[PDB]
Amino acid sequence: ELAYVRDGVIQFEVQQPMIARDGPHPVDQPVHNYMVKRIHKRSLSAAF
Amino acid sequence: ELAYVRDGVIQFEVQQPMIARDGPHPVDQPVHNYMVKRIHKRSLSAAF
């Protein structure tokens, strides 16, 4: 039942490993950066 | 409890061998040594 779906997006969330910094620093913030992955779709046919 | 500590210090004492000689050369007597150290304080910090 691959054809009834209009569009498909498979989100695989990962966050980068951040390194802590030492010294007089403006301190760093992490982000929940979201990974969009919209799926494509095709079909192949043959006739006789 | 580091924030309760001011200045970490260390000491060292070394003694080194000698050699017996002859001749008009000057006299000789053993040695003692004392080297004393400080520390370096820093901070790994983060944010979110």
Side-chain angles (χ1 to χ4, degrees):
Chain A
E1 197 73 21
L2 176 151
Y4 177 74
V5 304
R6 179 187 310 159
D7 281 327
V9 177
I10 308 302
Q11 48 174 352
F12 266 7
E13 168 68 54
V14 69
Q15 56 286 320
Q16 87 276 342
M18 89 176 304
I19 287 174
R21 289 300 293 168
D22 182 338
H25 286 163
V27 302
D28 285 340
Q29 69 270 28
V31 178
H32 197 191
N33 193 322
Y34 261 94
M35 306 293 289
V36 311
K37 296 164 182 301
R38 186 181 62 239
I39 80 176
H40 285 235
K41 50 158 302 167
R42 287 177 178 175
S43 198
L44 73 168
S45 316
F48 68 86
Chain B
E1 294 111 330
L2 270 179
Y4 306 74
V5 169
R6 173 201 309 129
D7 266 14
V9 303
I10 321 175
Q11 286 189 160
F12 284 106
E13 60 183 1
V14 74
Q15 76 285 29
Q16 65 188 0
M18 72 91 57
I19 298 192
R21 314 149 55 118
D22 201 277
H25 293 305
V27 283
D28 187 294
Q29 76 194 4
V31 288
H32 63 277
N33 225 26
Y34 262 70
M35 284 176 301
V36 295
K37 295 284 97 176
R38 48 193 298 148
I39 210 169
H40 312 156
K41 64 181 289 295
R42 281 166 70 194
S43 199
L44 281 171
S45 315
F48 78 111

